[PDB]
Design a protein around this ligand. Structure first.
Ligand SMILES: [Zn+2]
Ligand SMILES: [Zn+2]
Ligand SMILES: [Zn+2]
Ligand SMILES: [Zn+2]
Lengths: 9, 96
């Protein structure tokens, strides 16, 4: 499975 | 393929693993799946498995990964105040 990194509220 | 930028389980961003099911936009923290590393290869997220039995889900909570097969859908989801989006028992239908 693919992952990504997004901003954490 | 489109995916959300927040975890479907807890609502926050961060390191997210993405569902491989066709057209599923859901993404999750590994922690929130009770996993310690990403699944290897093609992976379908928990939204596609019934909460109550081993069967595939066909009816979906729109606010968390709870979902239900044909035999378990009745009474497990209600239309919410948010455009009638269906919610499971874990959300206030008036403020999901
Ligand atoms: Zn999470
Ligand atoms: Zn999915
Ligand atoms: Zn079921
Ligand atoms: Zn739910």
């Amino acid at each position: 499975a693919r992952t990504k990194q997004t901003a954490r509220k | 393929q489109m995916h959300e930028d927040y975890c479907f389980q807890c609502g926050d961003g961060g390191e997210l693993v993405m569902c491989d099911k066709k057209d599923c936009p859901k993404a999750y923290h590994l922690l929130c799946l009770n996993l310690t590393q990403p699944p290897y290869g093609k992976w379908e997220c928990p939204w596609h498995q019934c909460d109550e039995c081993s069967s595939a889900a066909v009816s979906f909570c729109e606010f968390c990964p709870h979902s239900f097969c044909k035999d378990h859908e009745k009474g497990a989801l209600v239309p919410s105040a948010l455009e009638g989006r269906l919610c499971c028992s874990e959300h206030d239908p008036m403020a999901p």
